Write an enzyme that holds these catalytic residues in place. Sequence first.
Site, PDB file in Angstrom:
ATOM      1  CB  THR A  87      17.306  38.202  -5.420  1.00 17.05           C
ATOM      2  OG1 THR A  87      17.637  38.433  -4.044  1.00 17.05           O
ATOM      3  CG2 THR A  87      18.617  38.049  -6.205  1.00 17.05           C
ATOM      4  N   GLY A  89      10.464  38.854   3.672  1.00 15.58           N
ATOM      5  CA  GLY A  89      11.819  38.392   3.409  1.00 15.58           C
ATOM      6  C   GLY A  89      12.790  38.970   4.438  1.00 15.58           C
ATOM      7  CB  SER A 128      -0.916  -0.028   1.239  1.00 16.03           C
ATOM      8  OG  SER A 128      -1.694   1.161   1.367  1.00 16.03           O
ATOM      9  CB  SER A 164      17.272  41.138   2.432  1.00 15.57           C
ATOM     10  OG  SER A 164      16.689  40.851   1.196  1.00 15.57           O
ATOM     11  CB  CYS A 194      13.087  36.052  -2.890  1.00 12.45           C
ATOM     12  SG  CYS A 194      14.744  36.499  -3.344  1.00 12.45           S
TER      13      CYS A 194
HETATM   14  O1  LIG Z   1      14.573  38.803   1.777  1.00 12.07           O
HETATM   15  C1  LIG Z   1      14.813  37.734   1.177  1.00 12.07           C
HETATM   16  N1  LIG Z   1      15.283  37.859  -0.095  1.00 12.07           N
HETATM   17  C2  LIG Z   1      15.528  36.744  -0.892  1.00 12.07           C
HETATM   18  N2  LIG Z   1      15.293  35.471  -0.398  1.00 12.07           N
HETATM   19  C3  LIG Z   1      14.849  35.334   0.864  1.00 12.07           C
HETATM   20  C4  LIG Z   1      14.606  36.436   1.677  1.00 12.07           C
HETATM   21  N3  LIG Z   1      14.146  35.933   2.838  1.00 12.07           N
HETATM   22  C5  LIG Z   1      14.118  34.587   2.800  1.00 12.07           C
HETATM   23  N4  LIG Z   1      14.535  34.198   1.557  1.00 12.07           N
HETATM   24  C6  LIG Z   1      14.729  32.837   1.004  1.00 12.07           C
HETATM   25  O2  LIG Z   1      13.527  32.217   0.658  1.00 12.07           O
HETATM   26  C7  LIG Z   1      13.458  30.951   1.299  1.00 12.07           C
HETATM   27  C8  LIG Z   1      12.002  30.555   1.480  1.00 12.07           C
HETATM   28  O3  LIG Z   1      11.434  30.401   0.196  1.00 12.07           O
HETATM   29  P1  LIG Z   1       9.887  30.043   0.098  1.00 12.07           P
HETATM   30  O4  LIG Z   1       9.627  28.703   0.678  1.00 12.07           O
HETATM   31  O5  LIG Z   1       9.491  30.085  -1.373  1.00 12.07           O
HETATM   32  O6  LIG Z   1       9.123  31.113   0.877  1.00 12.07           O
HETATM   33  C9  LIG Z   1      14.304  31.066   2.583  1.00 12.07           C
HETATM   34  O7  LIG Z   1      14.791  29.820   3.041  1.00 12.07           O
HETATM   35  C10 LIG Z   1      15.417  31.950   2.040  1.00 12.07           C
HETATM   36  O8  LIG Z   1      16.411  31.180   1.413  1.00 12.07           O
END
Ligand SMILES: O=c1[nH]cnc2c1ncn2[C@@H]1O[C@H](COP(=O)(O)O)[C@@H](O)[C@H]1O
Lengths: 320, 317, 316, 317
Positions: A180, A260, A18, A262, A178
């Site tokens: 970036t 985030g 299963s 940052s 993020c």
């Molecule tokens: O301010 C930020 N800028 C870019 N990436 C971030 C930031 N904060 C967290 N992350 C990344 O995003 C991940 C989470 O991704 P999620 O599961 O798609 O929300 C975290 O483990 C970080 O690696």
Amino acid sequence: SLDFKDVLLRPKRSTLKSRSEVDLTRSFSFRNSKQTYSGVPIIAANMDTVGTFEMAKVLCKFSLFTAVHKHYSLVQWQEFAGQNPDCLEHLAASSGTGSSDFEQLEQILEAIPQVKYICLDVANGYSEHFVEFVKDVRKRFPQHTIMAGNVVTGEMVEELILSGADIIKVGIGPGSVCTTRKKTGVGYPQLSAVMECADAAHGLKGHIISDGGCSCPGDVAKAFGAGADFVMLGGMLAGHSESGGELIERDGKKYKLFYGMSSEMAMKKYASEGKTVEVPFKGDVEHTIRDILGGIRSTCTYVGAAKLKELSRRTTFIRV
Amino acid sequence: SLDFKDVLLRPKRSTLEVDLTRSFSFRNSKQTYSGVPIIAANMDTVGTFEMAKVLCKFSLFTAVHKHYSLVQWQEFAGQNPDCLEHLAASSGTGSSDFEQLEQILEAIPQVKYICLDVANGYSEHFVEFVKDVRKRFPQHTIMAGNVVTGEMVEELILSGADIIKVGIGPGSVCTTRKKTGVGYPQLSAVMECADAAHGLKGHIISDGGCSCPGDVAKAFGAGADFVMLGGMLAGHSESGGELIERDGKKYKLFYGMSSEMAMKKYASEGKTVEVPFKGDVEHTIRDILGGIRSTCTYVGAAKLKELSRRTTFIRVT
Amino acid sequence: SLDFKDVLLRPKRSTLEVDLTRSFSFRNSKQTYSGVPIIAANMDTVGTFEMAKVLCKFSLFTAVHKHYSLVQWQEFAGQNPDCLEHLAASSGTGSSDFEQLEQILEAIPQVKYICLDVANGYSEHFVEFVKDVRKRFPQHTIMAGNVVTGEMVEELILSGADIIKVGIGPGSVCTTRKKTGVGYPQLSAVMECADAAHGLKGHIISDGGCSCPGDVAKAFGAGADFVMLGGMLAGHSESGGELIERDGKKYKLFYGMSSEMAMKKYASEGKTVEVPFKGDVEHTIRDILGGIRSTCTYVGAAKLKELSRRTTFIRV
Amino acid sequence: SLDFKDVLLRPKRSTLKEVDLTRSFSFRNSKQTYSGVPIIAANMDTVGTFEMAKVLCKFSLFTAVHKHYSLVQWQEFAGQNPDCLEHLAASSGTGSSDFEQLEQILEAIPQVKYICLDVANGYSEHFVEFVKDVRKRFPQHTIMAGNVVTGEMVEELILSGADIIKVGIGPGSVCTTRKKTGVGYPQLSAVMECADAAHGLKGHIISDGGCSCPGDVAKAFGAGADFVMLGGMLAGHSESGGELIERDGKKYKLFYGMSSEMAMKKYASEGKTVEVPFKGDVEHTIRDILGGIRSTCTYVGAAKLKELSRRTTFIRV
Ligand SMILES: O=c1[nH]cnc2c1ncn2[C@@H]1O[C@H](COP(=O)(O)O)[C@@H](O)[C@H]1O
Ligand SMILES: O=c1[nH]cnc2c1ncn2[C@@H]1O[C@H](COP(=O)(O)O)[C@@H](O)[C@H]1O
Ligand SMILES: O=c1[nH]cnc2c1ncn2[C@@H]1O[C@H](COP(=O)(O)O)[C@@H](O)[C@H]1O
Ligand SMILES: O=c1[nH]cnc2c1ncn2[C@@H]1O[C@H](COP(=O)(O)O)[C@@H](O)[C@H]1O
């Protein structure tokens, strides 16, 4: 150039009994620390709204892992450790490359010997400065298993493992909060990143974390299918009772802040590459964990993997 | 056939403040430039003197719009002697446009750049205009556009243009593509036109299509010497366009220079939008520069000059 | 497998007001055409007498819909003698439609164009109808469709049609594609069919799928001799379809000729929409011609005849 | 990797002079004979209803009856509707309880000559052996079994005793398999591959899921599916199950996946719930689907449904 949405997994003939027969536990021996791991290799992200002690207490019950955020005091840690002695083995203390970050990490690790994992975290894991920092942490804590990142390519994976990291965190720009990619144009399709980084790390008997970009259990299964040893989750685990983030009740609905590390919100609280959202409140995280694990168990069942260890071997991606 | 949205920059091993300044020596004018090679578009809502005054503090460039009077120019110049070195006066091919231009350049010798700007840079008529302006102003640096392909970039440089404006149809308030079916994906245009200009030791401007600091980085990474911005600089205190407060919110008009709104004011290939009000442009400029610095850091470029060399684009779905 | 949205035209060096007129000599009718080769579709909401009166002033063409009485035609002709040279009388297949057509053509000899229009121009039944019409009206120029592939264009031209109407399923209020799965991307259809037609010294109409002047430009650039427009001309004063004022806005009905709305009025493969009211069609005609003139300018074409010649498509 | 949205059928020259949508099949293992219009109401509790069967019979369509009727309800239905029994299947999963219920139905209603064995994962050796067992137990009944999406498994199930293989994993309108597990397969590709596999053994397939318009049904037949099974397109009618909900001035019916939480509660989720705007009597929907497919046959020159796949040429869009 593949993201999660570009693929499906092909079902395959199986001889399983299963789907209750499916074991999501993995066993790992880490290259550099020489330490051993047994658990369900899904990690709560070290974001201040996700990697909380309340999150860790629930996740421990499913043998899941928590990378704790870096905004608890030593007294908070010692209180938690005192009250939750059986939660310490799938737990990491986190640090950036700051002298103050490093100090704080060192006090936690000295005060709380049961914490055997370190998560070293920067947005740009490609700098020489981060490499040298990883080497120093490795010298200071020879028996602690080190997660380090982030990067998206094999060359940088090898160098970080050879510099002393056990587990490389993979992902630049895929994260739900993020920015970036919009602010800099830098990044890498996450599934392709995982495939490349997984091969590069496994060649050295190291390991990776697929960090970011998962929005459903299906994505988690794909990341594992692509060879990720661990998957790290931020947004999927945000918005729960156990999550950090202010509870906001407005216009008859409930929301939690998620942002985030940052983001301007984070930087004010403690140039921006993160944003803020309000997540509809989700209730208790245990229901979410059950959904995630159930989904991955079915994936295993569909491809004939009796254990999560067999998933990437049994995975054939169909391009959609 | 690439747009900015089709790519990401690969991060690279670095050993590293990033220097965003560039130094150029122009092929035909023989003049030199030092500054941050991001230009405020010569749109009437963007290339304003108020925009110029702030952008100067960051060493950015302003192509001034063509709807100020000589008295207004003389006024600005006399009170802002230090903005004048990163300023272009703009003209179309009109007799009247050229006359306005000549008066400005005569009365304000500090203005050492000319932005010659038409929708269709492929016309012999435009080519002959460039030659005439090169004859008239042998020492002035000439920006000329717009085009999207190499053969035309070559022809324009050999005709005397120093810097070729690249872009047909990518702009945020442009309707060329819907009205005419004509255009060219901006990233591919930039890559091709950059190779063409650089083969003759000339230069290009990526003109249009940037809606975030990452786009600006991709343009630079693809070999643009300069990036020109309209939409990203619209909507600020320093921008033109009427302030409209409605439904308890604040907006600024932003419109194409060939929009019915522009034409009425002074066949259409531009539109009008209302932009939510953005406040002071200074904060936008920092956000843009901070984005691009971080790009440089991610790919191991110590200075903007190194960025295109260190850029490997990754194709994304 | 290209649609209009899949391409842009590349600008080109030029040495140049652009002439949007074309001159054609028809393969079978042996008649000649001079005009701007944009056609108002024979939909009951578009191919109206009011539409024809405006379009004539710009030398555009009107395929009149098939739901006017002979008395209505006689009255329009009597009052509007100068609007008859770029007009077609339209017909479907079958006895009653043929009979109607004949009466109109007999009563109004200035009408020199016939638009034969069915959903499926691939049937034997349609081919034989084209043959009958040709034999009955050997000096009338015949538009016949619809098809999307070269073998059928050739057969229809050899069966006596002058201009083949190209497009199955691209129309703004067509549901053929959802109902039947059948169709063909319009730009590829145009390229293929134009080559087929032009090999026999025939002509085509790109019929359907244009929603902006750029689309019209692409259609010509791909080699279409004519472009037929429905949706772009619906919603005007001169359009049919009821004016509906509701929620403080004005709308006009626009609907497929095989919509339940149309079938009821007189198995559906058309739908009904309400189009915000657009005002007088004149302003729309100028925007269309203005955009196509600018296309010609961008690619160096002094005349519309030169546009397909100077067209290089870029995949986007 | 094809889905229904990725293609159109090419029209073709015809000499037709109404299209017959009836097919006749002779089944590989049961040796039984079929004649009817091979479109099947899915065995979801909101679709595979007795009320549905009664209307669909009038058009010679087939109903896979859901698993949640009692034995007395079956016997009542069959007594009152003897003419519907030829074109229905009784259904069962692999659970002991399901199979027993089915045995009781087949014992009570000897006119029921089709069995629908339906699991989410037809790739398990457990399912293969269950198919063998049902074939041993019911040698003269025609057995539909699934679901799968690849040829090797089609062949194995056919060799194991199944007559008709149900094809589709993840395409269903209220399925969440693909989001929860990442597992699936583009439905048009699955049909083409599986049809070829089946036909080489003289078996048959059902394209199960992913049709949201008559054009999709036509494409599935055109790809070689012998039958097409519909859930969503038949939901939301008078004859459908699902609660009728009148709210905000409108009428809706629930429609939900048989592994949704709603279904599990009622009787780890891979289905969802939706509210479908009420559609009225299913007869008008049936006329629309049939008219659509007859019209596809006309466009391609098929006098008969049996000729459609042979006259089908797909164009990629
Ligand atoms: O301010 C930020 N800028 C870019 N990436 C971030 C930031 N904060 C967290 N992350 C990344 O995003 C991940 C989470 O991704 P999620 O599961 O798609 O929300 C975290 O483990 C970080 O690696
Ligand atoms: O009316 C117009 N139609 C088409 N393009 C225009 C028009 N007005 C300005 N532009 C272009 O759009 C550029 C700005 O692009 P943006 O930064 O994307 O908003 C300008 O520098 C011009 O090259
Ligand atoms: O009901 C219908 N079904 C499919 N196509 C139709 C129908 N009625 C009109 N058309 C076509 O649509 C064309 C106009 O397309 P449009 O310019 O995109 O609106 C007409 O010239 C007809 O060929
Ligand atoms: O809970 C579910 N999860 C996944 N698929 C389902 C579920 N319930 C029904 N289905 C499938 O979806 C089909 C109907 O698909 P539809 O015609 O697209 O609505 C059924 O015949 C089943 O194969």
